[PDB]
Design a binder for this molecule. Structure first.
Ligand SMILES: [Zn+2]
Ligand SMILES: [Zn+2]
Lengths: 228, 765, 43, 188, 183, 146, 151, 67, 47
């Protein structure tokens, strides 16, 4: 929030340290009003909802099992029971090695079949039981974390730490009209050049008003104009 | 009036400085060099041989500096001030004895000179050693000059204390974004200096070495080092811990992912990537290259069919990387004063002399070859002429390195500059603070203020206020008032003593119980485990206090990493502290009475175990009391005198604890620039620039340090009658109002003295 | 590697552009310590 | 290198110097060596730099005649006047304690101590000051030198150790109209 | 308050200790079975213990891959060196007395894969020498010292130990104050 | 300061032996750090206000702070009453030793004295550990200006 | 240990003893001697050392006539002056309160239970002679004793 | 070096007091304060001129080049 | 799995041999643990 922030803005860095998306909501409550949206925007949840990942072998069949718990999904108000986890696992597993036939055995236990110059089955099983917990079953695959905040008042908003603004505007329970990131290059790709120059002006003003500097806003407007 | 130990214990500080002065790092290092390291260099390069004529061996049997065996008395040296005047080097000859064979079966000695060694002022070899100010007056020397510097070509050159990372020690260092964890040891042996990394890449621990072409999977290296059970590898790098085993299982499996392995197979995998050796001994490119691959992988020379030491070293390094991976903050801080070693003028000059002596011997062997390469008329008579003419290269190299500060060492293959600086003669305190100066290691990534930060661990080791302004700020550090820089002590008798004290050797124990008890280390190297580590540490400290082991050997027990470390190397900064036992301080004012009476000097306080030196790592285990009035039974040591946390220069400030600290640092800068008295011979000197105050006055408010360092004898300033008031409007923003007629009467009067040198040189025609 | 080429006469702080072309040593200039004077006009 | 081109050593100094040592000698390599030491007495002027062991440096801004300086009951005048605005922001209370300690020290006949985490105690110095007839806080009542009236504030007044720093405006003053130019750039 | 004498014996006797880094010290409440040992090897001046304990072909043996990959894999090979370590003694109690016999070159017997070495050699089949280079060059040049086996003979050794300890007895005359500086 | 030292110490005893209520944004280590940081800042503020209100009229630093020529009430309170808390890299002074700032404090100590709170004023003078902590903060400022 | 990962007892896939990090220490003090089942740091180690003294004495009174057991004793290398050394060096004299001590000569030193080594230790007697050579195995080791000089 | 002739502040002649102050300290030994007051150095500036003077000329004369 | 050979304590691996049997087939040693109507499961708790 100082000279480094101004340096990043003027360099127009496509990646910045600490991006924040200030997504206001449509409802005012914690229980099942803010936390529902917060669940809609989160980093990784399979490790959060598995409560263990198994490695089952038999005479001839190798099953990667994960007995999901409903307690986490109900306490942390998420919206996914089995099949959402399954489809997320498919793309993730296909991305790393592959995903041919994922199965569900019921009772919240999704079972992944693994089948075939030797020991490839064991190597794939090892890397699978490693890389399986760290997959995204809910939320956005770019958000660092999500925090629900208070602007020294009574309404509650979530400031998220991700790199997706279109997705957060499109998520339900968030006003897409009033949702502002710190990221000028993210505003430009999503909202356009005029909103981007608004963002440049506003962020430089914010950086110069937290320090008690007094710079006439016409200088900042000229800087944004010359940039855009 | 009876001694009150709560206030007379500070007399340990004058007693300490009476025998271990402010310029003692330099003097001790140069004395050690000219007294043992010259003999060690001669023994190392004892014989120089030629390919032809096996009936010929030229031996180096004895070396000396500044004294022949023809006369009992020492050689005549030109006095250092005469060297300053005539622009000569203050140097002593380097005398050796030679066994060179005659043709007709004759064996004989001699005492020949192989150059001139520049002599540090007030060293063992210096004419100023033990002079009583009458000899000093006759020699035109100031008795208050610190010494500790060289005169080469009439210029006073100090080899500044250099601060580097500890050699042969593992530093774990994690990272963010990249998410690597890197443990590195700089193995600085006598003949080689190499870095052995243990990286993390894609969740897998690897080993990286400059010689090796590729980063090697770690389990492959652990198998190559005799640890092939593939279960003890897990028991060596994780022990019994669910998290660590989970982290390391990937590397365990990648051992087999290539293929299943034996020791010799892993050795072959290591040897397939050892780059080359400049195409000599080419007949060894086989499995037989792994041996020097593994004995070059670190500073632990393995010379047998056992790899216990090196294998466990690699395993401990890997365990450190794994602990850092699981729990960050388990990494070492590179700016911790326990991780720093101070190399000194003696060690620098030793490296320089050994390299110049190797070049001398190579050239001398070649000249011998040329002389003896004739068919006929090859009389052996006077083989020493080529030594009478090639001896000037030693003198020239030593003079050039000290004069320029550039150190071209080919063996270690580094070119460093700025080693020596001109002794600043702006003021007496300027010279004194130039000594006790420490320059930090380069390549610190100066963009950041990590090393520039003041560390809490430098308390009482480095001056808290004496750091420069400008670019250098924390990069230049000064020694605190009462400190000591340890010397290399032999680790062999200490390891035997550890075995005597209950350390079962590292070869008798199994892997499963390795992380069940504390493991005893020795200069970072695991030498066994110990039952009752605290009792072992206590017995070791008792042995150190009773004088059985050396007092500069430090032992400390680390509790997070279950280890008992013993350090014996030099370059550790340490300070004396009063031992507190059973809630009582051990000095108890009878020893203070004897100390004030004249007997019972400071070193008797060590020979009776009343005080001991603590380096920074031992303070990690101590519990030090600032004053005797606040000792609790849990405490271990007592401060001798808390103001010793400031160096010599900051000791000029009166009441520095009532000032805001940047003002104290600014005074550290300004005092070095104060105009005053330089030396008692400052009018006999002919210097390039000299500012002298006409009527110096000693401060009305001095400190203990001022009289300890004798600043009250050569003060830089005057006691101005000062009125603190706004006046005339010409005193705004720090401007001063000076009294005319104080100036007229000599207040603030000073003179500049400048030297111009010409040479009436001679010409070819 | 001290050899000084044309691309080193141009490049840098003390090179050609940044050292001579926009920013250079000037004639009829001076420098000394400053002192206060409250009797001078501010201009 | 018969005929000898002149290469005299010219003194190029703004202010005159004196010759106090001429040393004729030979160096180690046989050839004559000449050293001439030039001494230059300096009188403090405007722009000369002084410091007080507490990081409160500052140039001489004015040199005033003694009668213009304020004086106390005994006619003592300051040699230096340190502006009071340098204290509140720099927070060098050790400088004030040094003034009081040095004042009590000269009055008592003893050099005092300002040793870190110790030194001469402020209350003992105050006792000396009161016993000698001075205010305990080191503030004497002064008379203005230019009007003669009592100053309406008591002035913190006493000895302070001052260092003349090597930075003297005589060595800093520089003025160039036209002179040498670089052979390459033709620039000054 | 009672006494337990110490006897030192076996000056010329040479003793070794094996440390099997492969077999646990005990698998239940009683010590584990001593592994059957047959066809031992050793090397003088190089001190390489090599032991070949035969495995179980009855179960958990994988005969087909065993014989297809490496011809003779009946015997599990344990290889290790003996390391000099002073102050090491072996002890037992005979008549309320403890008898100490010095150990020489204790060894940690790791599993050995000789058949893998030779199978790989048959797969691949188609000068000062200081430091540890000399060690392995010696190992593969001056080698091949067979060594017979004889277990169970303990009584002759024990009755030698007792005999050599009842004939000699000497007094300690050096002060404990000089002993601390003799460490 | 005694009523504030006891508060910080009982927070330490809670965080150690039991469990103190972790903040929504801060875990046990950050909760305690922010808690007693706010405590120490408030206590320095109170002592400063008492100092400023007690100061005499014609007090020179007070005059210079009132007119705005030089210095602030914070500087006056540091000179007279208390040099509050030495903030290094944005928080209390770190551990230069094994889970401990100085060997002159017990190991695993998070008391204000041991972590950079300077109970003294510049008038009363700093004890050696406060002197070191203050030098660390001031050196950070100096390196920052470089 | 902890939640471990699942004809002949001694020929089953040998899994590592696994414990979590939350109490990796509390396991350690129990499984220092639990891996044996043999037939504040000041007071704590003193109690440990005394308990080990009792365990050593139990082992010795269990050793009184056994023909196969052994117990390796670690002794200082440069012993008190009397290897060419033979006979009655000294004794393991047991003090009061249940603690042991050793007088290797006139000097007095205290005993210790050494390190635990959870692997088989077998003692052999190499006998190489020109006629024939044999590896006279004798027995197995039951634990190590360390004897350290005291002041 | 050598004692100033005049007090820097008042201008009082203190250069005739150095030898007598040394004699009062050495012979008939007195305190520095009483010795200073016995010489008429009442003002603290005048007392400073003598109390703080360092007599470097006596050291500089040990290096006499015209012996 | 993290399973080690009873013979050489090396790392154990599963293999698909004749008739697809999932044996724990050690390398570097003639070891094999055939699974005969048994389940070998190595799970890890997740927070
Ligand atoms: Zn006067
Ligand atoms: Zn195996």
């Amino acid at each position: 929030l100082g000279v480094p922030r101004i340096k990043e803005i003027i360099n127009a860095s496509k990646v910045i340290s600490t991006p924040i998306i200030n997504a206001v909501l449509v409802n005012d409550n914690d229980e099942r009003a803010a936390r529902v949206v917060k669940g809609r925007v989160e980093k990784t949840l399979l490790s959060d909802v598995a409560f263990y990942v198994q490695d089952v072998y038999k005479d001839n069949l190798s099953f990667i099992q994960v007995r999901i718990d409903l307690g986490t999904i109900d306490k942390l108000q998420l919206e996914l029971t089995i099949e959402d986890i399954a489809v997320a696992i498919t793309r993730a597993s296909k991305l790393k090695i592959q995903a041919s036939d994922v199965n569900i055995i019921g009772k919240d236990r999704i079972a992944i079949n693994v089948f075939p110059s030797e020991n490839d089955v064991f190597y794939r099983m090892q890397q699978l039981r490693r890389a399986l917990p760290d997959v995204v079953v809910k939320g956005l695959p770019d958000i660092s974390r999500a925090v629900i905040n208070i602007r020294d008042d009574g309404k509650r908003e979530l400031l998220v730490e991700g790199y997706g603004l279109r997705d957060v505007m499109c998520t339900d329970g968030v006003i897409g009209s009033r949702t502002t990131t710190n990221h000028v290059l993210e505003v430009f790709s999503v909202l356009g050049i005029e909103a981007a120059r608004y963002s440049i002006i506003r962020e430089i003003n914010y950086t110069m008003s937290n320090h008690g500097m007094s710079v006439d806003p016409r200088h900042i407007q000229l800087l944004g104009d010359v940039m855009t | 009036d009876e001694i009150n130990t709560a206030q007379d214990k500070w007399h340990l500080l004058p007693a300490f400085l009476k025998v271990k002065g402010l310029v003692k790092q330099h003097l001790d290092s140069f004395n050690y060099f000219v007294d043992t390291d010259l003999k060690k260099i001669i023994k190392a390069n004892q014989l120089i041989l030629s390919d032809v004529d096996p009936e010929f061996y030229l031996k180096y049997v004895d070396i000396r500096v500044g004294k022949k065996s023809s006369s009992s008395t020492k050689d005549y040296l030109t006095p250092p001030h005469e060297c300053r005047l005539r622009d000569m080097t203050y140097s002593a000859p380097i005398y050796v004895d030679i066994e060179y064979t005659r043709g007709r079966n004759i064996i004989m000695h001699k005492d020949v000179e192989i150059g001139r060694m520049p002599i540090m002022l007030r060293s063992n070899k210096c004419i100023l050693y033990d002079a009583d100010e009458s000899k000093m007056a006759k020699l035109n020397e100031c008795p208050l000059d610190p010494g500790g510097y060289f005169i080469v070509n009439g210029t006073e050159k100090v080899i500044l204390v250099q601060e580097q990372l500890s050699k042969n020690r593992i530093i774990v260092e994690a990272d963010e974004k990249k998410g690597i964890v890197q443990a590195s040891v700089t193995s600085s042996t006598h003949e080689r200096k190499s870095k052995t990394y243990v990286i993390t890449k894609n969740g897998k621990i690897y080993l990286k070495h400059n010689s090796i072409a590729e980063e090697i999977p770690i389990a492959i290296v652990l198998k190559a080092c005799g640890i092939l059970s593939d279960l003890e590898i897990m028991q060596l790098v994780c022990g019994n811990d669910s998290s660590y085993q989970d982290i390391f299982a990937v590397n365990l499996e990648e051992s087999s992912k290539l293929d299943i392995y034996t020791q010799q197979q892993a050795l072959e995998y290591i040897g397939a990537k050892v780059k080359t050796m400049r195409r000599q001994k080419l007949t060894i490119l086989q499995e037989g290259i792994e041996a020097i691959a593994t004995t070059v992988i670190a500073h632990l020379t393995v010379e047998a069919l056992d790899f216990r030491e090196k294998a466990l070293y690699i395993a401990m390094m890997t365990r450190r990387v794994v602990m850092a991976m699981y729990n960050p903050k388990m990494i070492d801080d590179r700016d911790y004063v326990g991780n720093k070693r101070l190399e000194l003028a003696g060690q620098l000059i030793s490296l320089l002399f050994e390299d110049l002596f190797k070049k001398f011997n190579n050239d001398f062997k070649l000249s011998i070859d040329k002389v003896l390469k004739k068919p006929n008329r090859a009389m052996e008579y006077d083989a020493l002429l080529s030594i009478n003419v090639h001896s000037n290269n030693i003198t020239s190299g030593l003079n050039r390195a000290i004069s320029t500060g550039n150190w071209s060492l080919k063996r270690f293959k580094m070119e460093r500059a700025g080693v020596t600086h001109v002794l600043s003669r702006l003021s007496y305190i300027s010279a004194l603070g130039m000594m006790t100066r420490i320059s930090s290691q380069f390549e610190k990534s100066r963009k950041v203020s990590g090393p520039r930060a003041l560390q809490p661990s430098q308390f009482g080791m480095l001056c808290t206020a004496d750091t420069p302004e400008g670019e250098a700020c924390g990069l230049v550090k000064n020694l605190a008032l009462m400190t000591h820089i340890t010397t290399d002590d032999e680790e062999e008798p200490i390891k035997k003593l550890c075995y005597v004290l209950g350390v079962e050797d590292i070869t008798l124990i199994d892997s499963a119980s390795l992380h069940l008890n504390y493991g005893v280390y020795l200069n970072g190297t695991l030498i066994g485990s110990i039952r009752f580590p605290t009792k072992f540490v206590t017995q070791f400290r008792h042995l150190r206090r009773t004088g059985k082991v050396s007092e500069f050997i430090s032992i400390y027990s680390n509790s997070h990493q279950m280890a008992v470390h013993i350090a014996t190397d030099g370059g550790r900064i340490c300070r004396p502290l009063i031992i507190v036992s059973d809630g009582q301080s051990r000095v108890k004012d009878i020893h203070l009475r004897k100390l004030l009476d004249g007997e019972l000097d400071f070193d008797d306080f060590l020979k009776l175990g009343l005080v001991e030196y603590l380096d920074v790592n031992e303070e990690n285990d101590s519990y030090i009391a600032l004053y005797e009035k606040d000792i609790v039974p849990s405490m271990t040591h007592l401060e001798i005198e808390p103001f010793t946390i400031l160096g010599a220069v900051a000791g000029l400030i009166p009441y520095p604890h009532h000032n805001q600290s940047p003002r104290n640092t600014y005074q550290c800068a300004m005092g070095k620039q104060a105009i005053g008295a330089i030396a008692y011979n400052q009018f006999k000197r002919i210097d390039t620039l000299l500012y002298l105050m006409t009527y110096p006055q000693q401060p009305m408010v001095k400190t203990k340090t001022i009289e300890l360092i004798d600043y009250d004898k050569l003060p830089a300033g005057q006691n101005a009658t000062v009125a603190v008031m706004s006046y005339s409007g010409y005193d705004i923003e720090d401007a001063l109002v000076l009294n005319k007629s104080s100036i007229d009467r000599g207040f603030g009067r000073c003179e500049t003295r400048r030297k111009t040198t010409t040479v009436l040189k001679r010409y070819a025609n | 590697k001290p050899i000084r080429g044309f691309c080193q006469r141009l490049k840098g702080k003390q090179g050609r552009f940044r050292g001579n072309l926009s920013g250079k040593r000037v004639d009829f200039s001076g420098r000394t310590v400053i002192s206060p004077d409250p009797n001078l006009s501010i201009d | 290198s018969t005929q000898y081109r002149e290469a005299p050593v010219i003194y190029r100094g703004p202010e005159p110097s004196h010759i106090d040592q001429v040393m004729m000698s030979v160096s180690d390599n046989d050839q004559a060596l000449i050293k001439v030491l030039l001494r230059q007495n300096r009188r403090p002027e405007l722009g000369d730099k002084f410091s007080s062991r507490h990081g409160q440096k500052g140039v001489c801004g004015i040199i005033v005649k003694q009668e213009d300086m304020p004086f106390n009951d005994q006619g003592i005048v300051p040699d230096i006047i340190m502006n009071p605005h340098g204290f509140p922001s720099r927070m060098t209370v050790g400088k004030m304690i040094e003034l009081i300690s040095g004042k009590a020290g000269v009055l008592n006949g003893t050099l005092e101590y300002g040793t870190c985490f110790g030194g001469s105690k402020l209350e003992d110095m105050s006792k000396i000051l009161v016993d000698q007839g001075f205010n305990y806080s080191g503030k004497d009542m002064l008379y203005s030198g230019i009007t003669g009236e009592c100053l309406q504030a008591y002035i913190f007044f006493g000895p302070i150790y001052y260092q003349k720093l090597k930075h003297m405006v005589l060595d800093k003053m520089h003025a160039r109209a036209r002179g040498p130019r670089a052979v390459l750039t033709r620039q000054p | 308050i009672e006494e337990f004498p110490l006897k030192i014996s076996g000056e010329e006797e040479s003793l070794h200790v094996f440390q099997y880094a492969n077999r646990p010290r005990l698998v239940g409440r009683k010590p584990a079975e001593h592994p059957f040992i047959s066809a031992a090897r050793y090397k003088p001046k190089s001190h390489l213990w090599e032991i070949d304990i035969p495995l179980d072909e009855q179960a958990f043996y994988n005969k087909d891959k065993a014989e297809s990959e490496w011809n003779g894999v009946n015997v599990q090979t344990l290889k290790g060196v003996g390391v000099e370590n002073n102050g090491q003694y072996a002890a037992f109690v005979k008549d309320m007395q403890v008898y100490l016999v010095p150990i020489e070159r204790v060894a940690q017997l790791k599993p050995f894969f000789k058949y893998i070495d030779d199978a790989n050699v048959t797969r691949k089949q188609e000068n000062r020498l200081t430091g540890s280079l000399l060690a392995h060059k010696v190992a593969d040049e001056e080698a091949n010292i067979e060594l017979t086996w004889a277990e169970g003979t303990f009584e002759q050794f024990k009755d030698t130990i007792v005999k050599e300890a009842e004939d000699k007895t000497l007094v300690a005359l050096e002060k404990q104050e000089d002993y601390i500086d003799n460490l | 300061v005694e009523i504030a030292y006891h508060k910080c110490d009982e927070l330490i005893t809670l965080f150690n032996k039991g469990e103190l209520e972790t903040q929504p944004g801060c875990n046990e280590e950050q909760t305690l750090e922010a808690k007693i940081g706010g405590l120490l800042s408030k206590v320095r503020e109170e002592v400063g206000d008492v100092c400023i209100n007690e100061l005499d009229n014609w007090n020179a630093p007070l005059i210079m702070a009132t007119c705005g020529s030089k210095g602030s009430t914070l500087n006056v309170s540091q000179m007279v009453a208390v040099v509050g808390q030495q903030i290094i890299s944005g928080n209390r002074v770190p551990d230069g030793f094994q889970d401990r700032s100085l060997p002159h404090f017990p190991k695993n100590s998070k008391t204000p004295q041991s972590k950079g709170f300077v109970r003294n004023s510049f008038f009363s003078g700093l004890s050696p550990p406060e002197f070191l902590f203050h030098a660390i903060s001031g050196r950070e400022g100096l390196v920052d200006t470089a | 240990x902890x939640x471990x990962x699942x004809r002949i007892e001694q020929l089953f896939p040998v899994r590592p003893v696994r414990v979590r990090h939350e109490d990796v220490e509390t396991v350690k003090r129990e499984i220092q001697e639990a891996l044996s089942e043999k037939p504040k740091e000041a007071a704590a180690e003193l109690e440990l050392l005394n308990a080990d003294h009792q365990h050593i004495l139990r082992k010795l009174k269990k050793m009184n006539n056994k023909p196969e057991r052994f117990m390796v004793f670690q002794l200082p290398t440069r012993l008190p002056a009397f290897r060419e050394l033979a006979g009655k060096v000294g004794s393991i004299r047991v003090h009061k309160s249940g603690k042991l001590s050793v007088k290797i000569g006139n000097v007095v030193m205290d005993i210790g239970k050494g390190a635990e080594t959870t692997f088989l230790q077998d003692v052999i007697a190499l006998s190489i002679a020109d006629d024939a050579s044999s590896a006279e195995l004798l027995g197995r080791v039951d634990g190590k004793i360390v004897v350290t000089p005291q002041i | 070096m050598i004692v100033p002739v005049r007090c820097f502040s008042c201008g009082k002649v203190v250069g005739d007091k150095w030898e007598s102050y040394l004699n009062l300290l050495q012979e008939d030994e007195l305190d520095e304060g009483t010795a200073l007051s016995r010489l008429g150095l009442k003002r603290y500036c005048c007392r400073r001129m003598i109390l703080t003077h360092v007599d470097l000329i006596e050291k500089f004369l040990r290096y006499n080049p015209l012996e | 799995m993290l399973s080690f050979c009873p013979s050489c304590n090396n790392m154990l691996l599963i293999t698909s041999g004749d008739s697809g049997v999932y044996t724990l087939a050690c390398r570097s040693c003639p070891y094999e643990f055939p699974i005969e109507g048994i389940e070998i499961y190595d799970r890890k708790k997740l927070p």
